[PDB]
Design a protein around this ligand. Structure first.
Ligand SMILES: Nc1ccn([C@@H]2O[C@H](COP(=O)(O)CP(=O)(O)OP(=O)(O)O)[C@@H](O)[C@H]2O)c(=O)n1
Ligand SMILES: [Mg+2]
Ligand SMILES: [Zn+2]
Lengths: 615, 1340
DNA sequence: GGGTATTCGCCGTGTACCTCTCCTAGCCC
RNA sequence: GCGGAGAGGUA
DNA sequence: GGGCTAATGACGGCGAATACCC
């Protein structure tokens, strides 16, 4: 029993030790931080770095012997804090959040001494940690030796990990306040103060907005100079007059040189911001992406605060035609039930009919509510009127992707759809009331069942996940990239999985970053498109898009010839960094973690119908 | 209204009239334990039942009987408060009257000797407090009710997972309260098997065999016979037409001259009707049809005697021929309809190896006790005691009720023991359901789940103690001599008291009171746990079990349950629900007389609720119990729909009856998603009492019920007038009405000031009332922790604004204004207890003296001469909390050193210090100290001060009571002295003590003076003995554990102010960590200049669909706006008229409300007082589902002269610029949860390491490092981070030489390392090597 | 006897953290 | 006063 | 205090050990 089992041994004491120079505390926002830093309380920092403090104190001669250094730390005089600031300067610390699902659960930051007893965590990284500021706690470790320090600052630092190891996409995308602020900033309005005045650049746009001579969102013609690295790494300024909002100009100030203006020109929601970061990374590189992300955070937070977005009871508009829809559906259900009592339709058929009519009524009310709420601002220009995408705060919260989905908007202002009883069967009468209105005992009770089942599901789901990810990381741990190229010709012919109606997942993403097994030819022989094994980066993928390659044979890890590990080429590039895999990397564990961590949100055919006109 | 209500009335929304008032919320615990003690004649529920169940204890056929008369509960020696103070269990001695009777074996039964024992003592039983808790070692424990499967019979399905080919295999389980379990199950091959409680599966018929039934008797009892007559030739059958339902025809069915069904065509309904109307009984049938049937009885050859065919043997032509030649005219076959009626008992009989009764009992014995050779009488006794022994097998009154109801028997009252008819009926129902004429039961039905409260569980544990002591006494009465011993050497109290204290202290259901909030206590006491003894384990339990069943309606709260791993297994009980007589759950309903909704309420259980169509409470009734709508919304079989007016049997009592108290406290519950309501209630139960609790601006009205019913308030028992008010006691002079005629006196309520609660929070009571105010029975004198004037004030209500403020409220985090810390409104007092124990070692007893070796006089400075800190001294981590000395022995000092010791004064006895020190990093003021000495220990100085402090108070209290009674007696003596010669000049001016020595003319009056003098003497002597008793209790050594000389406890009190990192919450499930303290100027402010207190993130609303906080904020802004207006109108003191008019227009506010506040009472003072209390904002009461609709909030906002939309324009306190799009501001009632960052925060550089595996300790109490778990290891491996992981694995934790070398290297200002091999790995090698496994580290 | 079912029994069931009580026992000298 | 049970709670 | 002695409310998966069916 001592050896076997979780609590006993190997798991507990030989893979699960308990390090020194470590602490724990509650996490807090700290917006002012740089992406590569973290707010650390003074007292924990002193406690952690105690021996460093003693060493530095003795080097400076402030203390004769080690015991005098200890006494000086226990009094905590100004000299001690000065030495702590000096030693902390470049020393990075490791931040960890209790469920380290994937490798981004541990990251290194440079600490900044602060008051208080809570650890301050940079907002952008919360998504990586799955951190929320509602009592989540984090642990903080100190790398001691020089190799450990270099490893923490190089491999684990927040700024070096912007791309998820699972898929190539960015992890640090702005989450909710940032995206709300940016959304507010970029959306335009038909008529405001300063309609249609011409600005020489973003700087006077800011002059106008901060002085209250122009609205934060108002359509305007601005002269802008964008930069494009079209040549071999040189930036060429193109300068012209664009029709934009004040807000879009204000945002443009941050954007680094290489990016096209178009990027900011749109509504700038969650997706738009994410793809903005994506393009910034693909074109410029790491450091500009980091600084640009920090700038995005700051501007988003600032202008979200300036926006003053709130949520009042009237912000969620009951659709005017709800009561009619409900009374109509009730009359229809009454007619179908009476026409059942006479016995022209079975019980199951009546059930199906009622459920379908109720679903249709739910969709009707939802669509009516979305029409009411979506484009209701009928504000007037100089003369006649016009209509536009409303500025209803809950609607902006929905559309921006900051919080909430269409479903929850429905759940607030419409009828909250159908429910499932314990056994999975669907109750005949739905919940017609919404949270803006008040439910009554039955409708509440039903939704209570729903939420209870949900919670229990998440609990058991988490346990099962944990177990699955443990097996995965366990099985694939020893696999390492040992050789540069094994030199095999084998490979798998990879195609895009077109399940039925359309292309669920395209080729380009499926092949990006894989080396080819053999040269593929144009639709005409002796027209080599890709030399023997080449890493298929974005440029090759676009080139394939220009042609009409359908299926590509790529070298896969499973067919790799190398003994006792894998070779760089058979694997490919994909990483938190962009380049071909480096020899030595433990790909087994990264693969297992990437497959395991996301696993916590996992729960007729008569005629064929061609979707697009083709042969 | 009542007086405390007239003080401050709460504006109550809510349209429907409350017919039933909320019951006493703690009814469960008190009523159950009352039922437990309950001296009652007829043995019903109650200790009495246990005694009569276990007693009379008869010898092993020795003819020496033991009889029980009655028991008595001794008066507790220690009251509740003092018992908590002194750290002992609050309990009552239990005394039982017994008789030993010794008879004569050789003569007709006749009592030779009977001796009655003088109420023998059989141990101590803990008592329950007035509030429903238990003091077990000076800690308040609560025994949570337990939900568990009720005794009875249950028919389950267990389908889906049976060989994945369908084959739904049914089972009947008989579960008793006390006794072994019975189980009948099927098998893939439709053979019905029995499995005693949890063993292997035997053929069921063996139990039928054990019951003394012969095979023919069984086949009689179960199968429907079919008769085959032979008349003059060939086999004619008696046929019941209706039996043919659904059967392909196997022969040609001719009747009465006409073929009806051709051979081969399946019998159609037309043919069935034909045959039925024709009245066909007998038809001759071809032998092929019978060529397949089975024989019922064991037909022997009656003539010669040789058996031919046995019972339940398949028939073949040759056997039919033998039967026909033997002369058997009447054949009884079985009816095996492969569709409906199967051959189940037949096939079980075929697999059943046992034949005789004896073989069945042998097989049973080999099942119960495998391996020991069974002897006949052993098996007989085993089987008898299994199901039919009164003592071992008892179902219950409840078990029997459920059993008979399940099998459709009119008789409710049965015998405890399992009778044979019971088993046969159970098997009949099982095979019936197997045919398909019945439904399976669902375990999750509250009609199948029974609640065991405190008294019941205590009774079970006490019975267990009795069975222990009975076996013991049995042996002692058998072996030992009969007539020598008296009835107290024979009976041992040790097992009873052991079992009881084990249950109360160390049990799963006996748990700590969650005692930091009044709500926490009250909700903890009313809890229903599915865990505990005979309960499912939380990890094992499936998700389907933990869901909320429609039966829970109005019985258990659907929304209040811990969201941790045991979600769904806790289920706090709803408001109005009760326990049945049989321990089920029932909820009140209003009767419906066909048209009128009457006012008599009937409590219905789950099953009774199932049958009827029940109308909802929020149904519109006009003036005569008539429904306004023609078709109303009801529920009938667990599904809601519309029913007609003249169909509803009952109607819900009130909207609140669905939810628990915790959930009932949340306002606007109707607008919160169930998830966030759940989390809100669970969190709301964690709030810590602040310094001055005030009130919720937006409540539900339940606050007074919760506060009163919890024991935290001080409530008047006999109404009167407040005579004396102090911040420790309230003394009231009783009203003459309630005044007892004989020996009444006055009522005195001693309050409790800062003491330590289970969670280390402060429990302090403040007086509400003032001198000379009249109080009635049931008013709130003193406010407990976090309650105000009778109302529940869990947290405090502050002005919040929903907006994002430069991402400082980014996630669920919360921003707070420096005004909040300035106004000192989130500062809580906590209280740690520390104990220093001086035991007696064999090298010598340790000492508490202040003379402590090699400590500087700095450490002693704050210690008195006795060695205990002064009360009120401020201490810090590392300061010496109390002084203790460790004895040293075998010193063997050199002779010159001994001479040096004499002059210097050095003590060989000491040289080591065991002094307790304040824990590292905790700093507060010592508010109280207690000292407990055992027998033979001298009282220390501290002991003298504490004894005098308690004594002088006690003296004062006795003196006050005595002085009032003496003044009364003297007044009466003056009233007699005035008769018989008036003397008023001399008398009133001379002292009162000069009234006994005066005289009067010899008459009856002198006789009355002698009477009153002797009464005076009697009062003095009673006073003196009561005083002596109190003084004996104060002085006595407070009994310590064996080996401990004395104990000194020290209480520190610490004022914790809110700071960044602490957790704060609302009532609706919104959470957050306080992220930054902003200066007052930076915080947003409205045009008027008032700054907001909290700036709350809006993005928590849309995805976390708790809209109740928004309406709460709006209504709270409305209430505080009105309150502000009334404060403004009051500061200028216009005139009473204006105030009364305004307050009345506010209290009325529309119509259809059940409020009715006249304001007529006390035209001037009480109205002015009530305005004084509402000036801070008028408290509202929105009930949970019968709440305030938006229009009403709009009206209330308008009455205050505030924007009707509930949003205001705000100016940025930092920049001064306006925010676009006005933002919601208003007052919301927020709570500070017990998760305080300073408790959570922790760091270590180096410290103590663990014993076996030399890794650093885990924890916060001891320094302790964080756990770098396997997931973190994997994280590091995903990177190429080899050196970091290496140091983390060896240098940071496990390598001893490595860690010290690294410390030295770091100190030297160099950063390298020397990893070595972890010590835990070496421990691993040693542990594996300890097995027979050689594991060596090789080298080459 | 040899292959196929069936019972049978063992093995597993997420991380990190924070409070409290309770800890060898019974009988005899 | 290193440990381990039981109970509760946090994310 | 000290001295002496020593029951019942998981579930799935898998592989080995009989039960039995030709
Ligand atoms: N039994 C449990 C329950 C919770 N957790 C942890 O609490 C978090 C759940 O986030 P979550 O996604 O469930 C809620 P949140 O992240 O705040 O977003 P939302 O409120 O807008 O929906 C995860 O980090 C879990 O590891 C756990 O380890 N075990
Ligand atoms: Mg969180
Ligand atoms: Zn390869």
């Amino acid at each position: 029993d001592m050896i076997k089992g979780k609590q006993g041994r190997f798991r507990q004491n030989l893979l699960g030790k308990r390090v020194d120079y470590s602490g724990r505390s509650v996490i807090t926002v700290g917006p002012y931080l740089r992406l590569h830093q973290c707010g650390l309380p003074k007292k924990m920092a002193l406690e952690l770095f105690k021996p460093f403090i003693y060493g530095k104190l003795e080097l400076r001669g402030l203390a004769t012997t080690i015991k005098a250094a200890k006494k000086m730390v226990e009094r905590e005089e100004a000299v001690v804090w000065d030495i702590l600031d000096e030693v902390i300067r470049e020393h990075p610390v490791l931040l960890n959040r209790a469920p380290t699902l994937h490798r981004l659960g541990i990251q290194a930051f440079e600490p900044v001494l602060i008051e208080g007893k809570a650890i301050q965590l940079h907002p952008l990284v919360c998504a990586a940690y799955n951190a929320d500021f509602d009592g989540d706690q984090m642990a903080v470790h100190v790398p001691l030796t020089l190799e450990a320090q270099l490893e923490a600052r190089a491999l684990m630092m927040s700024t070096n990990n912007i791309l998820s190891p699972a898929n190539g996409e960015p992890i640090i995308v702005p989450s909710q306040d940032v995206v709300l602020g940016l959304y507010y900033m970029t959306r335009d309005c038909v008529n405001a103060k300063g309609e249609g005045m011409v600005l020489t650049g973003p700087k006077e746009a800011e002059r106008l907005y901060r002085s209250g001579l122009a609205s934060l969102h108002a359509r305007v013609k601005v002269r802008i100079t964008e930069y494009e690295k079209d040549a071999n790494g040189e930036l060429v300024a193109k300068t012209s007059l664009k029709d934009t909002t004040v807000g879009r100009a204000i945002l443009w100030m941050i954007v680094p040189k290489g990016l096209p203006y178009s990027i900011v020109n749109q509504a700038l929601g969650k997706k738009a911001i994410s793809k903005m970061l994506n393009t910034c990374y693909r074109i410029l590189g790491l450091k500009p992406t980091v600084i640009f992300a920090d700038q995005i955070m700051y501007t988003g937070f600032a202008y979200a605060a300036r926006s003053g977005a709130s949520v009042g009871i009237d912000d969620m508009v009951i659709p005017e035609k709800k009561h009619e829809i409900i009374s109509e559906a009730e009359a229809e259900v009454a007619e179908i039930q009476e026409q059942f009592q006479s016995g022209l339709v079975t019980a199951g058929e009546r059930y199906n009919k009622v459920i379908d009519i109720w679903a249709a009524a739910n969709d009707r009310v939802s669509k009516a509510m979305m029409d009411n709420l979506q484009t209701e601002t009928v504000i007037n220009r100089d003369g006649q009127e016009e209509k536009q995408v409303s500025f209803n705060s809950i609607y902006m919260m929905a559309d921006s992707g900051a919080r909430g989905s269409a479903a929850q908007i429905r759940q607030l202002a419409g009828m909250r759809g159908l429910m499932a009883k314990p056994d999975g069967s669907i109750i005949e009468t739905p919940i017609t009331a919404n949270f803006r209105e008040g439910l009554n005992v039955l409708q509440y009770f039903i939704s209570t069942h729903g939420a209870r089942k949900g919670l229990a599901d998440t609990a058991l789901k988490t346990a099962n996940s944990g177990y699955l990810t443990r097996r995965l990381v366990d099985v694939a741990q020893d696999l390492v990239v040992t050789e540069d190229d094994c030199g095999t010709h084998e490979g798998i012919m990879m195609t895009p999985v077109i399940e039925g109606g359309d292309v669920k997942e395209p080729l380009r993403d499926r092949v990006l970053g894989r080396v080819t097994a053999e040269d593929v030819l144009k639709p005409g022989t002796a027209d080599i498109l890709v030399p023997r094994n080449t890493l298929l980066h974005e440029q090759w993928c676009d080139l394939l898009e220009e042609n009409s390659v359908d299926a590509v044979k790529v070298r896969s890890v499973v067919s790799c010839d190398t003994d006792f590990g894998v070779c760089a080429h058979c694997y490919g590039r994909d990483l938190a960094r962009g380049h071909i895999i480096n020899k030595g990397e433990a790909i087994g564990v990264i693969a297992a973690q990437s497959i395991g961590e996301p696993g916590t949100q996992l729960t007729a055919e008569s005629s064929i119908q061609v979707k697009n006109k083709g042969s | 209204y009542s007086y405390t209500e007239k003080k401050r009335i709460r504006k109550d929304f809510g349209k429907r009239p409350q017919v039933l008032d909320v019951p006493y919320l703690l009814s469960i615990q008190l009523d159950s334990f009352q039922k437990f003690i309950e001296q009652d004649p007829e043995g019903q529920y109650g200790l009495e039942a246990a005694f009569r169940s276990v007693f009379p204890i008869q010898s092993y056929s020795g003819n020496s009987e033991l009889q029980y008369v009655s028991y008595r509960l001794g008066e507790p020696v220690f009251d509740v408060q003092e018992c908590q103070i002194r750290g002992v269990t609050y309990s009552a001695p239990l005394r039982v009257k017994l008789r030993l009777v010794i008879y004569e074996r050789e003569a007709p039964e006749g009592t030779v000797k009977d001796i009655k024992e003088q109420e023998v003592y059989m141990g101590e039983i803990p008592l329950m407090t007035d509030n429903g808790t238990f003091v077990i070692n000076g800690t308040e424990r609560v025994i949570v009710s337990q939900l568990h499967r009720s005794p009875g019979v249950f028919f389950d399905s267990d389908k889906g997972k049976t060989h994945s080919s369908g084959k739904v295999l049914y089972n009947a389980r008989i579960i008793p309260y006390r006794g072994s379990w019975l189980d009948f199950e099927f098998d893939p091959k439709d053979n019905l098997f029995v499995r005693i409680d949890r063993r292997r599966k035997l053929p069921a018929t063996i139990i039928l065999r054990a019951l003394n039934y012969t095979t023919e008797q069984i086949l009689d009892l179960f199968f429907e016979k079919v008769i085959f007559e032979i008349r003059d030739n060939k086999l004619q059958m008696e046929l019941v037409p209706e039996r043919l339902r659904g059967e392909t025809a196997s022969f040609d069915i001719e009747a009465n001259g006409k073929v009806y069904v051709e051979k081969g065509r399946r019998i159609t309904a037309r043919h069935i009707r034909q045959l039925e109307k024709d009245d066909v009984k007998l038809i001759e049938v071809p032998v092929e049809y019978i060529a397949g049937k089975v024989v019922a009885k064991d037909y022997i050859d009656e003539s010669t005697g040789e058996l031919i065919c046995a019972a339940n043997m398949e028939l073949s032509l040759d056997l039919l021929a033998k039967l026909s030649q033997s002369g058997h005219k009447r054949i009884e076959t079985l009816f095996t309809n492969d569709l409906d009626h199967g051959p189940y008992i037949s096939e079980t009989l075929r697999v059943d190896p046992t034949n005789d009764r004896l073989s069945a009992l042998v097989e049973i014995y080999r099942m119960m006790r495998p391996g020991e050779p069974p002897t006949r009488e052993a098996a007989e006794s085993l089987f008898e005691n299994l199901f039919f022994s009164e003592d071992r097998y008892d179902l219950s009154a409840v078990g029997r009720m459920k059993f008979n109801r399940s099998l459709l028997r009119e008789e409710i009252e049965g015998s405890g023991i399992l009778s044979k008819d019971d088993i046969i009926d159970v098997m009949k129902k099982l095979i019936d359901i197997r045919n398909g004429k019945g439904e399976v039961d669902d375990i999750d039905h509250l009609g199948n789940r029974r609640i065991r409260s405190v008294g019941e569980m205590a009774e079970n544990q006490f019975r267990v103690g009795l069975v222990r002591v009975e076996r013991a006494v049995k042996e002692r009465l058998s072996l030992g001599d009969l007539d020598t011993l008296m009835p107290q050497d024979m009976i041992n109290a040790k097992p009873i008291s052991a079992a009881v204290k084990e249950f109360f202290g160390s049990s799963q259901l006996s748990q700590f009171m969650d005692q930091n909030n009044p709500l926490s206590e009250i909700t903890h006491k009313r809890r229903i746990s599915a865990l505990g003894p005979g309960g499912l384990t939380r990890e094992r339990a499936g998700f389907e079990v933990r869901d909320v069943h429609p039966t829970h309606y109005g019985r258990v709260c659907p929304i209040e349950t811990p969201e941790g791993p045991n979600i769904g297994l806790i289920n706090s009980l709803s408001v109005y629900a009760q326990t049945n007589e049989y321990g089920f759950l029932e909820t009140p309903y209003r009767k419906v007389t066909d048209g009128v909704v009457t006012d008599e309420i009937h409590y219905l259980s789950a099953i009774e609720e199932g049958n009827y169509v029940i109308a909802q409470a929020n149904s519109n009734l006009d003036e005569e119990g008539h429904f306004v709508e023609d078709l109303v919304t009801c529920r009938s079989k667990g599904e809601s729909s519309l029913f007609s007016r003249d169909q509803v049997d009952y109607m819900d009592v009130s909207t609140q009856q669905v939810v628990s108290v915790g959930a009932s406290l949340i306002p606007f519950l109707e607008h919160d998603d169930a998830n966030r309501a759940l989390m809100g209630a669970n969190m709301q139960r964690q709030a810590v009492p602040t310094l001055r609790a005030d009130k919720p601006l937006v409540g539900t009205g339940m606050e007074r019920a919760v506060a009163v019913d919890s024991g935290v308030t001080a409530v008047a028992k006999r109404g009167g007038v407040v005579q004396y008010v102090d911040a420790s006691r309230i003394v009231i002079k009783v009203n003459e009405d309630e005044m007892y005629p004989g020996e009444a006196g006055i009522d005195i309520y001693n309050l409790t000031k800062y003491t330590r609660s289970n969670q280390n929070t402060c429990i302090n009571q403040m007086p509400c009332v003032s001198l000379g105010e009249p109080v009635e029975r049931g008013d709130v004198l003193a406010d407990g922790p976090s309650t105000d004037l009778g109302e529940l004030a869990l947290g405090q209500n502050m002005r919040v604004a929903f907006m994002p403020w430069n991402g400082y409220n980014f996630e669920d985090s919360i921003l707070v204004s420096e005004r909040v810390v300035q106004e000192d409104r989130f500062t809580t007092i906590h209280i740690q207890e520390l104990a220093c124990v001086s035991r007696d070692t064999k090298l010598g007893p340790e000492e508490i003296t202040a003379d402590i070796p090699n400590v500087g006089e700095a450490a002693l400075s704050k210690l008195d001469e006795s060695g205990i800190v002064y009360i009120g001294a401020e201490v810090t981590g590392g300061d010496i909390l109390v002084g203790k000395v460790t004895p040293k022995g075998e010193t063997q000092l050199t002779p010159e050193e001994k001479l040096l010791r004499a002059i210097f004064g050095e003590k060989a006895s000491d040289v080591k210090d065991s002094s307790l020190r304040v824990p590292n990093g905790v700093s507060g003021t010592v508010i109280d100290v207690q000292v407990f000495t055992r027998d033979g220990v001298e009282k220390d100085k501290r002991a003298l001060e504490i004894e005098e402090m308690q004594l002088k108070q006690a003296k004062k209290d006795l003196s006050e009571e005595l002085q009032i009674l003496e003044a009364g007696l003297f007044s009466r003596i003056r009233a007699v002295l005035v008769a018989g010669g008036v003397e008023a000049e001399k008398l009133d001016k001379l002292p009162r003590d000069r009234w006994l020595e005066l005289g009067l003319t010899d008459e009856e009056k002198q006789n009355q003076l002698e009477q009153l003098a002797e009464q005076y003497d009697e009062l003095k002597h009673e006073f003196e003995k009561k005083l002596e008793a109190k003084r004996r209790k104060i002085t006595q050594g407070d009994d310590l554990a064996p080996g401990v000389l004395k104990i000194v406890k020290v209480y520190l009190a610490v004022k914790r102010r809110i700071q960044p990192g602490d957790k704060m919450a609302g009532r609706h499930g919104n959470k957050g960590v306080i992220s930054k303290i902003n200066p007052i100027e930076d915080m947003p402010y409205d045009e008027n200049g008032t700054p907001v207190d909290i700036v709350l993130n809006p993005l928590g609303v849309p995805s976390r669909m708790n809209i109740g906080q928004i309406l709460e904020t709006h209504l709270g802004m409305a209430a505080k706006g009105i309150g502000d207006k009334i404060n403004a109108m009051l500061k200028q003191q216009q005139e009473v008229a204006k105030l009364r008019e305004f307050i009345q227009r506010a209290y009325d506010l529309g119509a259809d409300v059940r409020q009715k506040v006249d304001l007529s009472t006390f035209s001037d003072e009480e109205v002015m007082r009530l305005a004084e209390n509402l000036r801070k904002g008028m408290p509202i009461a929105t009930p949970v589902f019968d709440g305030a609709k938006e229009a009403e909030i709009k009206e209330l906002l308008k009455l205050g002269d505030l924007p009707t939309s509930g949003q205001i324009r705000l100016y940025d306190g930092r920049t001064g610029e306006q925010f676009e799009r006005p933002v919601t501001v208003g007052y919301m009632y927020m709570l500070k949860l017990n998760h305080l960052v300073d408790d959570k925060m922790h760091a270590r550089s180096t410290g103590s390491y663990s014993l076996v595996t030399q890794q650093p300790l885990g924890g916060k109490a001891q320094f302790g490092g964080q756990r770098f778990g396997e997931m973190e290891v994997w994280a590091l491996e995903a990177y190429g981070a080899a050196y970091t992981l290496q140091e983390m694995l060896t240098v940071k934790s496990d390598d001893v030489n490595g860690r010290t070398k690294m410390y030295k290297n770091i100190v030297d200002g160099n950063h390298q390392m020397e990893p070595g091999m972890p010590e835990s790995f070496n421990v691993l090698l040693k542990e594996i090597r300890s097995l027979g496994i050689n594991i060596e580290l090789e080298d080459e």
